[PDB]
Design a protein around this ligand. Structure first.
Ligand SMILES: *[C@@H]1O[C@H](CO[C@@H]2O[C@@H](C)[C@@H](O)[C@@H](O)[C@@H]2O)[C@@H](O[C@@H]2O[C@H](CO)[C@@H](O)[C@H](O)[C@H]2NC(C)=O)[C@H](O)[C@H]1NC(C)=O
Ligand SMILES: *[C@@H]1O[C@H](CO)[C@@H](O[C@@H]2O[C@H](CO)[C@@H](O)[C@H](O)[C@H]2NC(C)=O)[C@H](O)[C@H]1NC(C)=O
Ligand SMILES: *[C@@H]1O[C@H](CO)[C@@H](O[C@@H]2O[C@H](CO)[C@@H](O)[C@H](O)[C@H]2NC(C)=O)[C@H](O)[C@H]1NC(C)=O
Ligand SMILES: *[C@@H]1O[C@H](CO)[C@@H](O)[C@H](O)[C@H]1NC(C)=O
Ligand SMILES: *[C@@H]1O[C@H](CO)[C@@H](O)[C@H](O)[C@H]1NC(C)=O
Ligand SMILES: *[C@@H]1O[C@H](CO)[C@@H](O)[C@H](O)[C@H]1NC(C)=O
Ligand SMILES: *[C@@H]1O[C@H](CO)[C@@H](O)[C@H](O)[C@H]1NC(C)=O
Lengths: 272, 423, 347, 42, 49
């Protein structure tokens, strides 16, 4: 089940359902995913091999992440230790005397005669029956916890593995691009790959551009920023690359007083 | 070393652990005992003991008694106590002591056991188990002031005859620790076996004919007596204490604030005494809580002392397996207590710590967090460092018309790992 | 949750040598209780540390001292100079903390204060920890560090409302950020331009109303009291069960040792040992359930910060009722107290 | 008997309590009990 | 000797009948404590569901 999730196809990305199935190669799915977080195709077409080298470094690094310092890998051991501690409690409670002369029924029969031996045996019976009731109550609570955590596991696979979540924090930190899941002891192990910026450039931006006509036609960027490099340019949100303003990245909006009133070197959308 | 023993292993992971506080020691005694009167046993020792159904009862409240003399005079044949032991009677104080004594043959001691269906339980005596009680059968001294009765007698029948004329018969049984109305027939003992006594009961007594039959057994060579002894606790401001050599009365004035053993008018224990504003009723010497614990005391000094329980300083151990060093966290206790009253240290927000070194370091990630933003960083002594809060980067708003943004120029792929348990 | 550990030898036997001799038979069970509680508190420390790693603000922007444009945010802002002890506590957070009765554990001088306190006080349950044997442990972060994480959220800058992801940091002032959020729900810039000051008056009156919204009839403030009571009732069970006789003559080992002799006194102590060891197991069992429940709820807290505080939610019912405009967060006893601000039409 | 004015209430024999509300088994009168009235010529 | 107090009162006399009844009191109170803890988890689970 898990190893089949890697080659699964669910849609074109820009589609709005699970009805269709598009056989887009894994390479072309990531670039469309990276174009959805605010990177233009010009950067992708120019940094094609750079992205793959970065991605392969990330995949090789998770080999060394299996250490107790990691939070996720610790939770794996905590689950195994939870299972182990369940069996330890059962074994320990047979070393409990509960006030009897011994924890062994053989010792009680060896050491005592009726009617005194029945009382000592009955002392172990009530204690062990009480211990099992406590064991059953704990097991039920663990079973419900695993049951409701399995529901989140189905949630994680559908939103992180089979698609690209737009939710911050969910499906890992940064900006989600692709998540891989593998079988783990008593659960699943995910690999939330994210887009982590490393360096920044501070650039002046504009809320929008308007022309001095009646009525003033105004535009706003689709998924990036208007940006200076006296001319205005479009850049992606997740990567800096000034590009001309066009219908591919400009969306018409109503007039606002915070937009730039342009008179020279107008973008093609604001012409005519 | 206690951490190794608790985990029962020489290999223990590095961390902060709660270990047992060391045993607290008493540091003196606080005795306040009055020179109370001697308990009057002159009725038991000088006189002829009565019968089982007409037993005498002695209640001692505010006196001391010499239990050695009483035990030397008598020779106990069998005692059965529940709730208390005779040695405990011999070495402790109690609010009251009730002794029901009577003449009783040793051959019939089986008829005084709990659950007997015989005539002794129904009509003569039934032991009450509402208080810690013991039943004692002994032999009186041969040539002392205790004079043997004529014989041993008990009531064999105590019934009511109320039917058409008299045919219907109903026995009258005694509640625990109570007399039978048939006692008044022969209050000094039945003369002969099978004596038949009849009285007409008044209307206020329910009416009918009361019939009582007495049974007499021959007197033995030595007088044999039976005692039913009960004690009470916490029901008086003064105690009945056997003459144990406790010692001289002491003053708590010189030892305020320390944990000492106390023996205050028969109430014993351990605790800390503090000068306090008088609360409660002074006439009642002790002030209790809901849980029946002693929380206040009124003394002959004239003050009211708060009796705090004897406590011990909490302990915690910080262990680092790789560097093999440890420190001790005395939680919620300032270093002045450890430095000056121990039977270098550094004051922190989590208590007083011995072992760490204040290097004033600040660390982004430390795996030994002491609490309150304090953690131990290994170095060959562990050093007390503060967890660091990385200041967020500040981007000033732009003064021009537009707004300023920070767009990435280089990037990496960060794989965040997560585990979801399923079964 | 309040971190509690017990001294099994002290809780069961109360320092009596005779009892501890009998407790050697049950020595394994005493050690497990100390280890189950210790293991259940490392989970709390990892939970708190991972929470504030998710809440962490990478980049923020300056905010004015109070009046930001036309919106007033004095209640949510840490003062420049603070008379109170807490350096990063907001005025509304003071009111919330001033309206809840919490006993001060005295993390550094509690043992000395309990000895000094003659008359009983509200810390009687706290001071009982040195008598019975349990130990209330300090939290991972002090209140100042917690306040720093929440204070940095008010000025947090992420990408613009129309931007994709959180790879960029736009320095849009608070006023212009509110107007964009209202523009994404169906209010045109023509309306926002015309009713600009009316919106500020509406927003300010909403912020000023919550100054007196901390009442027991409110659901959110009722929960913050139940969290404190749940911690207090966990310590009460520890202390009260030390007065259980468990069929013995007394619940105090002193009285048993003063009225009985062996072999009867050892049997009576065995009743208290078995009863107290089983009571500790139940206390440990419910402490694991509470710790895991709070750990899972600590996960939900970070989810709402990344969906209500750092971004406007397009959900329904999530991030409060109505249409989500903005949401703030303050530190509260054992968790967070969100103020989800919505758009409620009136005509 | 009102019992809100602590009518006919016997104090504990040898203990005292301060600033606490406690439940006690004991011999106490019934609330609203008229009792039996006795008159002396004086 | 029996789960019913009636049989304990019919078959025994004090002080033994109190010890046998005390066996039931401690057992049923501990059982009631387990019922409360079980119900609390169920109440909280249904409250978040
Ligand atoms: C010990 O007992 C009392 C202390 O009572 C105090 O009452 C308040 C004033 C407050 O200070 C509380 O914390 C205390 O519990 C003292 O008795 C009185 O002491 C004053 C001053 O010395 C004196 O004028 C009064 O006459 C005293 N009254 C009586 C009835 O003794 C007492 O002195 C204390 N002893 C010490 C502190 O050594
Ligand atoms: C912004 O809000 C704060 C908080 O309500 C206002 O300060 C209040 O002013 C008056 C008198 O000083 C009182 O309601 C309170 O005592 C103040 N609260 C404080 C200081 O926390 C402040 O006036 C508001 N600003 C404007 C411009 O109205
Ligand atoms: C029982 O006692 C209460 C309080 O002592 C009585 O209530 C008082 O009634 C009088 C009227 O006679 C009022 O003046 C007081 O203010 C009341 N005190 C309260 C309400 O605390 C009550 O009447 C008594 N019951 C009787 C007399 O039957
Ligand atoms: C653009 O022009 C309009 C109308 O003259 C004015 O209201 C607005 O402030 C101007 N904005 C800028 C940035 O010049
Ligand atoms: C108690 O009696 C014994 C023997 O009669 C005697 O030695 C002892 O001194 C007495 N104690 C007191 C306090 O009278
Ligand atoms: C460590 O020493 C510095 C020196 O001034 C002091 O300010 C600081 O409070 C000390 N640390 C502690 C925990 O006392
Ligand atoms: C009495 O108890 C109350 C709590 O009900 C408390 O507020 C008050 O301070 C106490 N008074 C004294 C003198 O201890």
């Amino acid at each position: 089940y898990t190893s089949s999730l890697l080659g699964s196809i669910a849609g074109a990305g820009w589609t709005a359902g699970l009805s269709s199935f598009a056989a887009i190669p894994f390479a072309q799915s990531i670039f469309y995913r990276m174009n959805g977080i605010g990177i233009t195709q010009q950067v992708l077409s120019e940094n094609q091999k750079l992205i793959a080298n970065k991605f392969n470094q990330a995949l090789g690094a998770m080999q060394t992440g299996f250490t107790t310092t990691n939070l996720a890998f610790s939770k794996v051991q905590d689950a195994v230790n939870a299972n182990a501690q369940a069996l330890s409690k059962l074994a320990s409670e047979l070393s409990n005397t509960f006030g009897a002369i011994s924890s062994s029924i053989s010792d009680i029969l060896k050491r005592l005669d009726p009617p005194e031996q029945e009382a000592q045996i009955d002392r172990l019976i009530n204690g062990r029956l009480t211990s099992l009731n406590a064991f059953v109550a704990q097991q039920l609570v663990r079973s419900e916890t695993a049951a409701r955590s399995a529901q989140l596991a189905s949630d994680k696979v559908n939103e992180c593995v089979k698609s690209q979540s737009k939710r911050n924090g969910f499906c890992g930190s940064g900006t989600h691009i692709v998540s891989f899941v593998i079988n783990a002891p008593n659960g699943f192990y995910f690999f939330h790959v994210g887009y982590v910026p490393t360096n920044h450039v501070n650039v002046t931006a504009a809320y929008g551009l308007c022309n001095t006509d009646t009525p003033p036609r105004c535009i706003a960027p689709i998924d990036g920023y208007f940006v200076l490099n006296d001319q205005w340019y479009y850049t992606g949100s997740s990567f800096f690359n000034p590009e001309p303003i066009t219908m591919a990245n400009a969306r018409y909006v109503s007039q606002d007083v915070k937009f730039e009133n342009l008179t020279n070197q107008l973008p093609p959308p604001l012409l005519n | 070393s206690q951490l190794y023993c608790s985990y029962e292993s020489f290999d223990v992971g590095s961390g902060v652990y709660s270990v047992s506080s060391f045993e607290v020691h008493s540091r003196g005694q606080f005795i306040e005992q009055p020179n109370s009167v001697e308990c009057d046993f002159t009725k038991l020792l000088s006189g002829t003991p009565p019968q089982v159904y007409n037993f005498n009862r002695l209640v001692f409240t505010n006196c001391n008694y010499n239990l050695t003399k009483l035990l030397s005079l008598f020779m106990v044949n069998e005692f059965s106590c529940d709730g208390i032991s005779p040695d405990a009677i011999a070495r402790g104080c109690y609010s009251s002591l009730t002794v029901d004594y009577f003449a009783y043959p040793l051959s019939m001691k089986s008829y005084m056991q709990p659950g007997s269906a015989g005539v002794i339980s129904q009509y003569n005596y039934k032991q009450s188990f509402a208080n810690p009680t013991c039943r004692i059968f002994a032999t009186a001294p041969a040539n002392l002031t205790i004079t043997k009765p004529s014989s041993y007698s008990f009531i064999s029948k105590c019934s009511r005859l109320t039917g058409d004329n008299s045919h219907i018969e109903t026995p009258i049984v005694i509640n625990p620790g109570e007399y039978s109305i048939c006692k008044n027939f022969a209050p000094n003992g039945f003369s002969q076996d099978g004596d038949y006594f009849t009285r007409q009961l008044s209307q206020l007594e329910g009416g009918g004919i009361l019939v009582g039959v007495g049974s007499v057994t021959p007197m033995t060579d030595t007088l044999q007596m039976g005692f039913i002894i009960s004690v009470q606790y916490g029901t008086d401001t003064n105690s009945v204490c056997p003459m144990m050599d406790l010692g001289n009365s002491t003053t708590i004035t010189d030892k305020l604030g320390v944990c000492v053993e106390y023996n205050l008018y028969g109430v014993s224990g351990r605790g800390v005494f503090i000068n306090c504003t008088a609360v409660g009723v002074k006439q009642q010497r002790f002030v209790y809580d809901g849980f029946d614990n002693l929380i206040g005391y009124y003394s002959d000094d004239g003050n009211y002392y708060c009796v705090r329980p004897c406590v011990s300083v909490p302990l915690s151990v910080v262990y680092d397996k790789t560097t093999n060093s440890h420190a001790t966290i005395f939680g919620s206790v300032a270093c002045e207590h450890i430095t000056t009253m121990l039977h270098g240290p550094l004051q922190t927000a989590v208590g007083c710590v011995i072992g760490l070194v204040n290097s004033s370091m600040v660390v982004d990630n430390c795996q030994l967090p002491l609490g309150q933003s304090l953690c131990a960083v290994p170095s060959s002594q562990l050093q007390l460092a503060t967890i660091n809060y990385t200041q967020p980067q500040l981007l000033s708003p732009l003064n021009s018309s537009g707004f300023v943004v920070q767009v990435p120029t280089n990037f990496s792929f960060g794989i965040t790992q997560e585990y979801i348990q399923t079964t | 949750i309040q971190k509690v550990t017990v001294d099994c030898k002290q809780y069961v036997c109360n320092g009596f040598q005779k009892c501890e001799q009998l407790l050697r038979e049950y020595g394994q069970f005493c050690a497990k209780i100390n280890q189950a509680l210790h293991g259940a508190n490392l989970m709390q420390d990892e939970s708190v540390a991972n929470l504030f790693s998710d809440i962490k603000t990478h980049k923020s922007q300056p905010l004015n001292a109070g009046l930001n444009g036309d919106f007033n945010l004095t209640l949510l802002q840490v003062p420049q100079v603070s008379t109170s002890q807490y350096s990063h506590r907001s005025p509304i957070e003071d009111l919330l903390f001033n309206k809840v009765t919490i006993a001060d554990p005295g993390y550094m001088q509690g043992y000395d204060d309990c000895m000094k306190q003659g008359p009983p006080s509200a810390r009687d349950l706290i001071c009982a920890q040195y008598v019975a044997g349990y130990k209330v442990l300090p939290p991972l972060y002090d209140p100042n560090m917690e306040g720093a994480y929440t204070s940095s959220l008010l000025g947090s800058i992420a990408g613009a409302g129309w931007t994709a992801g959180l790879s960029s940091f736009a320095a849009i002032p608070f006023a212009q950020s509110i107007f964009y959020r209202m523009n994404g729900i169906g209010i045109t810039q023509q309306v926002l331009s015309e009713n600009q000051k009316l919106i500020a008056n509406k927003f300010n009156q909403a912020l000023g109303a919550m100054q007196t919204g901390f009442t027991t009839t409110n659901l959110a403030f009722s929960k913050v009291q139940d969290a404190v009571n749940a911690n207090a009732q966990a310590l009460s069970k520890l202390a009260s069960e030390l007065s259980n006789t468990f069929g013995a003559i007394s619940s105090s080992i002193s009285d048993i040792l003063k009225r009985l002799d062996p072999p009867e006194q050892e049997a009576q102590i065995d009743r208290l040992i078995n009863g107290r060891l089983t009571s500790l197991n139940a206390f440990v069992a419910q402490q694991l359930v509470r710790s895991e429940t709070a750990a899972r709820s600590a996960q939900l807290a970070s989810d709402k910060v990344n969906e209500c505080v750092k971004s406007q939610s397009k959900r329904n019912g999530f991030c409060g009722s109505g249409t989500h405009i903005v949401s703030f967060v303050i530190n509260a006893p054992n968790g967070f107290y969100f103020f989800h601000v919505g758009y409620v039409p009136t005509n | 008997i009102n019992a809100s004015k602590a009518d006919g209430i016997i104090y504990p024999t040898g203990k005292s309590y301060s600033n606490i509300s406690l439940t006690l088994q004991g011999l106490f009168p019934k609330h609203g009990d008229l009792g039996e009235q006795y008159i002396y010529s004086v």
